[PDB]
C-alpha cells in the first residue's frame, strides 16, 4: 500500500495524539486537523505542522475521525460532502455506522477499525508494554470492516489501522454488523457489566460481610487469573455441573445472549451515536 | 519468617495431584514430613521425587498437623475416619471451606480445625521467570492466601498459617478471616460469582462464532484484549476511562438484579453442601 495522505480530525486530543504520532512517524503523509488550542500546542510540540483552513481537504486520501461517538454524526455531516470522490472516511467505532447515521454518499468509502487491545497472558517483557492495557506499545490484534466502497480500499484502510495501532499481530476482517456485535456488543454489553459486577462483589464482601477489602480483592484478582486461564484454554481445567447451574441461576440472566442480538446491538448503537 | 518451630506434618493423599506439590514443599522445609499415600500411582510419584513413604499408623501419634489433601467430596468420610484417631491438640488442616461450612466435619472439641485457601497468583503481576508467569495456581509465582481458625486455641492460628505459607510459597500476604467469611470467598466469590461470569464470557465468544459467523480467533482476540483493558481499568491497574453511558442498559440484560444473593450465607451454605456432597 502506497503512502497515502492521511488527515486526522481531532489530531491533538486524547483520542488522536497517539495515532497522529504513529502516522507522523510512518511513510504516510499527515494532515493534523485540530482547532483546540491545547491540542494544537500538543501537535506543535511533536514537530507537526498545524493546519489552517481547508486546503487539506483537497489533498486527503484518508480522513480519520478521531472523535467521540456522540459527535461523529455531526462531524461526518459536515465533512463527508466536502471530500473528493473515493476518499476513505475512517471511523474508529462501529456505533455510528451500525446506527445508520452516517451521511448518504455513494462515491466515497467508509472503513471501520477498532483495536482488540493487548491480550491477557501475554509474554511481553518491556515494562512499558507490560503496563500497556490499550495498545500502541504491547502487541494486539485489530478488527476492520469495509462498510462501503471499492474492494481495493479494504487493504488501504487496514494498512492505516495497522500503522495507527502498531504493533498489530493480526488484522481480522469482518462485516459492519459483526464489528458492531463485538463493540458495543461483546465489549460493553457483555464484558463490561460482568467486570463491574466483579468489583461490586468485592465491595459486598467488604461492606456487608466485614471482610478486609484487600483480602477480597486479592482473592478476586487471583481467581480471575486462574479461572480466565482455565476457561479460555491457557491452563487445564479441574458437582461442577450442578454447581455451575446453581450459580448461573442466581447471577446470570437466562437470555444474556440478547446482549449480542443485532436488534439490541443496533439500539445500543443508536443510543451511543446520539 | 514466623516464630513457629518445626512441626511434624502428615499429609493425607500426599502422592495425588493435589498432594504431591504441597508434600514437596513440606519435604523441602524445616518441618518434618509424614507422607500418607495408599494409592500405588501416588506412592510411585513420591518415590520419583525422592520423598519417603510413611507406612503403618505410627505416624498418627507423631503428627502435630494433619493436612487433608483430598477432594471435597470425600472430606467428610476421610475426617470421620481420622479425626477420632488423632491426639488431643492436633491441628486438622482443611484446604477448602466447603465441607467445614456445610457442617459435615465431625464434632470433636479437643482438636483444632484450621482452614486455608490460596488466592492464586494475581492476574496482573511483575513475574519474570517464565514458569512463574504461567503459574496460574500458585507455588512458583507469588500469591496471597486466606486462613481461618475454625476451632481450637488461638495459638494454633500462627501454626496453621505457617504451614499454609510453607505449602503455598511464595506467599506475600496471609489474610485471617472467620470460617463463614472464608466460605463467602469460596465457594461464594470464586464459584458463585466469578465462575459463572467467566463461563458466560467463553460462551459469548462461542455465540459470536456459532451464531453470527465471526471467525472464532477474531472473537477470542477481541474478548481477551477487552478483558485485559476492562479488568485493569475497573480494578485500578490503569486509569478509568458512552461506554459507561450504557451500563444500566446492558446490566439489565445480562446480570440478575439480585445477584448479591450469591454471597448470602444461606445460599453459600447450599453451595457448600452441594460441593461436599
mmCIF file of C-alpha atoms in Angstrom, chain A residues 10-225:
data_model
loop_
_atom_site.group_PDB
_atom_site.id
_atom_site.type_symbol
_atom_site.label_atom_id
_atom_site.label_comp_id
_atom_site.label_asym_id
_atom_site.label_seq_id
_atom_site.Cartn_x
_atom_site.Cartn_y
_atom_site.Cartn_z
ATOM 1 C CA UNK A 10 -9.096 15.824 16.450
ATOM 2 C CA UNK A 11 -5.417 15.086 15.926
ATOM 3 C CA UNK A 12 -4.154 16.737 19.097
ATOM 4 C CA UNK A 13 -6.660 15.412 21.510
ATOM 5 C CA UNK A 14 -6.815 12.471 23.816
ATOM 6 C CA UNK A 15 -8.162 10.182 21.131
ATOM 7 C CA UNK A 16 -5.852 11.475 18.459
ATOM 8 C CA UNK A 17 -2.396 12.321 19.654
ATOM 9 C CA UNK A 18 -1.173 8.735 19.854
ATOM 10 C CA UNK A 19 -2.345 7.707 16.440
ATOM 11 C CA UNK A 20 -1.184 11.017 14.988
ATOM 12 C CA UNK A 21 2.372 10.344 16.175
ATOM 13 C CA UNK A 22 2.262 6.900 14.586
ATOM 14 C CA UNK A 23 1.134 8.348 11.235
ATOM 15 C CA UNK A 24 3.617 11.157 11.526
ATOM 16 C CA UNK A 25 6.453 8.684 12.019
ATOM 17 C CA UNK A 26 5.189 6.453 9.145
ATOM 18 C CA UNK A 27 5.733 6.887 5.443
ATOM 19 C CA UNK A 28 2.179 8.151 5.118
ATOM 20 C CA UNK A 29 1.828 11.902 4.785
ATOM 21 C CA UNK A 30 -0.022 13.519 7.634
ATOM 22 C CA UNK A 31 -2.518 16.379 7.802
ATOM 23 C CA UNK A 32 -3.206 17.058 11.539
ATOM 24 C CA UNK A 33 -6.573 18.807 11.883
ATOM 25 C CA UNK A 34 -7.108 20.334 15.281
ATOM 26 C CA UNK A 35 -8.768 23.530 16.440
ATOM 27 C CA UNK A 36 -8.331 23.139 20.231
ATOM 28 C CA UNK A 37 -5.505 25.369 21.483
ATOM 29 C CA UNK A 38 -4.176 22.688 23.825
ATOM 30 C CA UNK A 39 -4.342 20.083 21.042
ATOM 31 C CA UNK A 40 -2.501 22.432 18.702
ATOM 32 C CA UNK A 41 0.258 23.010 21.254
ATOM 33 C CA UNK A 42 0.490 19.235 21.579
ATOM 34 C CA UNK A 43 0.865 18.815 17.792
ATOM 35 C CA UNK A 44 3.407 21.662 17.549
ATOM 36 C CA UNK A 45 5.336 20.069 20.357
ATOM 37 C CA UNK A 46 5.522 16.950 18.205
ATOM 38 C CA UNK A 47 7.007 18.980 15.421
ATOM 39 C CA UNK A 48 3.792 18.521 13.450
ATOM 40 C CA UNK A 49 2.720 21.421 11.223
ATOM 41 C CA UNK A 50 -0.637 22.832 12.091
ATOM 42 C CA UNK A 51 -3.287 23.222 9.539
ATOM 43 C CA UNK A 52 -5.368 26.205 8.977
ATOM 44 C CA UNK A 53 -8.330 26.314 6.708
ATOM 45 C CA UNK A 54 -9.414 23.543 4.391
ATOM 46 C CA UNK A 55 -6.759 23.277 1.727
ATOM 47 C CA UNK A 56 -6.080 19.928 3.280
ATOM 48 C CA UNK A 57 -9.472 18.576 2.299
ATOM 49 C CA UNK A 58 -8.453 18.538 -1.357
ATOM 50 C CA UNK A 59 -5.318 16.584 -0.526
ATOM 51 C CA UNK A 60 -6.716 13.857 1.782
ATOM 52 C CA UNK A 61 -6.858 10.273 0.544
ATOM 53 C CA UNK A 62 -7.992 9.157 4.005
ATOM 54 C CA UNK A 63 -9.832 11.134 6.692
ATOM 55 C CA UNK A 64 -9.708 9.672 10.195
ATOM 56 C CA UNK A 65 -12.476 10.691 12.597
ATOM 57 C CA UNK A 66 -10.603 10.593 15.926
ATOM 58 C CA UNK A 67 -13.588 11.993 17.732
ATOM 59 C CA UNK A 68 -16.136 10.793 20.297
ATOM 60 C CA UNK A 69 -19.127 8.769 19.140
ATOM 61 C CA UNK A 70 -21.675 11.374 20.124
ATOM 62 C CA UNK A 71 -20.337 13.906 17.618
ATOM 63 C CA UNK A 72 -19.466 11.568 14.761
ATOM 64 C CA UNK A 73 -22.805 12.151 13.078
ATOM 65 C CA UNK A 74 -22.492 15.922 13.091
ATOM 66 C CA UNK A 75 -18.827 15.948 12.091
ATOM 67 C CA UNK A 76 -19.437 13.463 9.268
ATOM 68 C CA UNK A 77 -22.418 15.523 8.102
ATOM 69 C CA UNK A 78 -20.067 18.390 7.669
ATOM 70 C CA UNK A 79 -17.003 16.637 6.221
ATOM 71 C CA UNK A 80 -18.437 13.887 4.024
ATOM 72 C CA UNK A 81 -19.894 16.154 1.344
ATOM 73 C CA UNK A 82 -16.632 18.097 1.191
ATOM 74 C CA UNK A 83 -14.143 15.322 0.414
ATOM 75 C CA UNK A 84 -13.082 14.203 -3.057
ATOM 76 C CA UNK A 85 -14.734 11.093 -4.582
ATOM 77 C CA UNK A 86 -13.007 7.927 -3.444
ATOM 78 C CA UNK A 87 -11.792 9.391 -0.188
ATOM 79 C CA UNK A 88 -11.689 6.886 2.660
ATOM 80 C CA UNK A 89 -13.595 8.096 5.698
ATOM 81 C CA UNK A 90 -12.221 6.033 8.562
ATOM 82 C CA UNK A 91 -14.300 5.574 11.663
ATOM 83 C CA UNK A 92 -12.795 4.102 14.832
ATOM 84 C CA UNK A 93 -16.001 2.609 16.244
ATOM 85 C CA UNK A 94 -18.901 0.769 14.706
ATOM 86 C CA UNK A 95 -21.652 2.536 16.688
ATOM 87 C CA UNK A 96 -22.424 5.448 14.335
ATOM 88 C CA UNK A 97 -22.064 3.253 11.282
ATOM 89 C CA UNK A 98 -24.352 0.471 12.598
ATOM 90 C CA UNK A 99 -26.848 3.030 13.953
ATOM 91 C CA UNK A 100 -27.282 4.159 10.364
ATOM 92 C CA UNK A 101 -26.432 7.804 10.965
ATOM 93 C CA UNK A 102 -23.526 8.144 8.521
ATOM 94 C CA UNK A 103 -24.422 10.510 5.674
ATOM 95 C CA UNK A 104 -25.531 9.030 2.413
ATOM 96 C CA UNK A 105 -22.808 9.465 -0.175
ATOM 97 C CA UNK A 106 -22.228 6.545 -2.506
ATOM 98 C CA UNK A 107 -18.980 7.666 -4.148
ATOM 99 C CA UNK A 108 -16.828 7.682 -1.016
ATOM 100 C CA UNK A 109 -15.594 4.835 1.172
ATOM 101 C CA UNK A 110 -16.480 4.178 4.797
ATOM 102 C CA UNK A 111 -13.983 1.984 6.640
ATOM 103 C CA UNK A 112 -14.293 0.950 10.283
ATOM 104 C CA UNK A 113 -11.446 -0.193 12.518
ATOM 105 C CA UNK A 114 -11.188 -0.997 16.181
ATOM 106 C CA UNK A 115 -8.469 -2.429 18.404
ATOM 107 C CA UNK A 116 -8.780 -5.665 20.308
ATOM 108 C CA UNK A 117 -6.340 -4.291 22.921
ATOM 109 C CA UNK A 118 -3.298 -6.322 24.125
ATOM 110 C CA UNK A 119 -4.290 -9.764 25.401
ATOM 111 C CA UNK A 120 -4.161 -11.292 28.799
ATOM 112 C CA UNK A 121 -1.478 -13.954 29.377
ATOM 113 C CA UNK A 122 0.938 -12.358 27.077
ATOM 114 C CA UNK A 123 4.682 -12.675 27.367
ATOM 115 C CA UNK A 124 5.601 -9.039 26.947
ATOM 116 C CA UNK A 125 8.922 -8.250 28.658
ATOM 117 C CA UNK A 126 9.262 -4.480 28.105
ATOM 118 C CA UNK A 127 7.778 -2.961 31.268
ATOM 119 C CA UNK A 128 6.159 -0.209 29.182
ATOM 120 C CA UNK A 129 4.463 -2.975 27.177
ATOM 121 C CA UNK A 130 3.502 -4.918 30.298
ATOM 122 C CA UNK A 131 1.508 -1.938 31.599
ATOM 123 C CA UNK A 132 0.033 -1.092 28.147
ATOM 124 C CA UNK A 133 -3.533 -2.230 28.501
ATOM 125 C CA UNK A 134 -4.813 -0.297 25.494
ATOM 126 C CA UNK A 135 -2.254 -0.822 22.752
ATOM 127 C CA UNK A 136 0.410 1.112 20.859
ATOM 128 C CA UNK A 137 3.330 -0.478 22.777
ATOM 129 C CA UNK A 138 2.229 -4.080 23.534
ATOM 130 C CA UNK A 139 1.181 -6.263 20.609
ATOM 131 C CA UNK A 140 -2.532 -6.534 19.815
ATOM 132 C CA UNK A 141 -4.864 -7.757 17.154
ATOM 133 C CA UNK A 142 -7.426 -5.421 15.478
ATOM 134 C CA UNK A 143 -10.784 -5.795 13.682
ATOM 135 C CA UNK A 144 -11.707 -3.987 10.473
ATOM 136 C CA UNK A 145 -14.700 -3.639 8.236
ATOM 137 C CA UNK A 146 -15.226 -2.206 4.756
ATOM 138 C CA UNK A 147 -18.695 -0.615 5.261
ATOM 139 C CA UNK A 148 -18.920 0.715 1.749
ATOM 140 C CA UNK A 149 -16.663 1.389 -1.154
ATOM 141 C CA UNK A 150 -14.473 -0.467 -3.628
ATOM 142 C CA UNK A 151 -12.858 -3.651 -2.529
ATOM 143 C CA UNK A 152 -9.301 -2.362 -3.047
ATOM 144 C CA UNK A 153 -9.905 0.144 -0.249
ATOM 145 C CA UNK A 154 -10.059 -2.630 2.344
ATOM 146 C CA UNK A 155 -6.236 -3.155 2.196
ATOM 147 C CA UNK A 156 -5.665 0.584 2.335
ATOM 148 C CA UNK A 157 -7.811 1.101 5.421
ATOM 149 C CA UNK A 158 -6.286 -1.956 7.053
ATOM 150 C CA UNK A 159 -2.790 -0.632 6.479
ATOM 151 C CA UNK A 160 -3.675 2.721 8.007
ATOM 152 C CA UNK A 161 -5.136 0.988 11.095
ATOM 153 C CA UNK A 162 -2.078 -1.281 11.380
ATOM 154 C CA UNK A 163 0.105 1.866 11.407
ATOM 155 C CA UNK A 164 -2.057 3.720 13.913
ATOM 156 C CA UNK A 165 -2.312 0.836 16.356
ATOM 157 C CA UNK A 166 1.122 -0.804 15.880
ATOM 158 C CA UNK A 167 2.375 -3.309 16.772
ATOM 159 C CA UNK A 168 -0.528 -5.281 15.328
ATOM 160 C CA UNK A 169 -0.273 -9.059 15.087
ATOM 161 C CA UNK A 170 -3.467 -9.999 13.259
ATOM 162 C CA UNK A 171 -5.982 -7.893 11.350
ATOM 163 C CA UNK A 172 -9.371 -9.558 11.295
ATOM 164 C CA UNK A 173 -11.755 -8.597 8.511
ATOM 165 C CA UNK A 174 -15.396 -8.560 9.491
ATOM 166 C CA UNK A 175 -18.670 -7.039 8.313
ATOM 167 C CA UNK A 176 -20.077 -3.804 9.716
ATOM 168 C CA UNK A 177 -22.697 -5.730 11.680
ATOM 169 C CA UNK A 178 -20.140 -8.204 13.002
ATOM 170 C CA UNK A 179 -17.917 -5.336 14.169
ATOM 171 C CA UNK A 180 -20.949 -3.815 15.999
ATOM 172 C CA UNK A 181 -21.654 -7.183 17.626
ATOM 173 C CA UNK A 182 -18.098 -7.139 19.010
ATOM 174 C CA UNK A 183 -18.415 -3.475 20.040
ATOM 175 C CA UNK A 184 -20.615 -2.419 21.615
ATOM 176 C CA UNK A 185 -21.999 -5.908 21.918
ATOM 177 C CA UNK A 186 -19.355 -8.112 23.357
ATOM 178 C CA UNK A 187 -17.195 -5.352 24.853
ATOM 179 C CA UNK A 188 -19.842 -3.113 26.503
ATOM 180 C CA UNK A 189 -22.954 -5.230 26.791
ATOM 181 C CA UNK A 190 -21.373 -8.496 27.874
ATOM 182 C CA UNK A 191 -17.880 -7.957 29.311
ATOM 183 C CA UNK A 192 -18.343 -4.568 30.967
ATOM 184 C CA UNK A 193 -21.296 -5.354 33.139
ATOM 185 C CA UNK A 194 -19.705 -8.525 34.339
ATOM 186 C CA UNK A 195 -16.410 -6.768 35.126
ATOM 187 C CA UNK A 196 -18.318 -4.117 37.083
ATOM 188 C CA UNK A 197 -20.216 -6.833 38.919
ATOM 189 C CA UNK A 198 -16.832 -8.377 39.956
ATOM 190 C CA UNK A 199 -15.844 -5.054 41.588
ATOM 191 C CA UNK A 200 -19.175 -4.721 43.250
ATOM 192 C CA UNK A 201 -18.886 -8.268 44.514
ATOM 193 C CA UNK A 202 -15.604 -7.335 46.191
ATOM 194 C CA UNK A 203 -17.415 -4.316 47.666
ATOM 195 C CA UNK A 204 -20.222 -6.561 49.016
ATOM 196 C CA UNK A 205 -17.689 -8.752 50.841
ATOM 197 C CA UNK A 206 -16.224 -5.685 52.495
ATOM 198 C CA UNK A 207 -19.357 -3.648 53.126
ATOM 199 C CA UNK A 208 -21.817 -6.316 54.135
ATOM 200 C CA UNK A 209 -19.701 -9.218 55.435
ATOM 201 C CA UNK A 210 -16.850 -7.372 57.086
ATOM 202 C CA UNK A 211 -14.047 -8.865 55.035
ATOM 203 C CA UNK A 212 -10.915 -6.749 54.709
ATOM 204 C CA UNK A 213 -11.220 -5.251 51.210
ATOM 205 C CA UNK A 214 -7.633 -6.189 50.347
ATOM 206 C CA UNK A 215 -8.389 -9.833 51.222
ATOM 207 C CA UNK A 216 -11.474 -9.852 48.964
ATOM 208 C CA UNK A 217 -9.523 -8.046 46.217
ATOM 209 C CA UNK A 218 -6.550 -10.389 46.439
ATOM 210 C CA UNK A 219 -8.951 -13.341 46.314
ATOM 211 C CA UNK A 220 -10.840 -11.995 43.287
ATOM 212 C CA UNK A 221 -7.808 -10.917 41.296
ATOM 213 C CA UNK A 222 -6.099 -14.290 41.822
ATOM 214 C CA UNK A 223 -9.253 -16.174 40.958
ATOM 215 C CA UNK A 224 -9.774 -14.188 37.764
ATOM 216 C CA UNK A 225 -6.258 -15.284 36.826
#
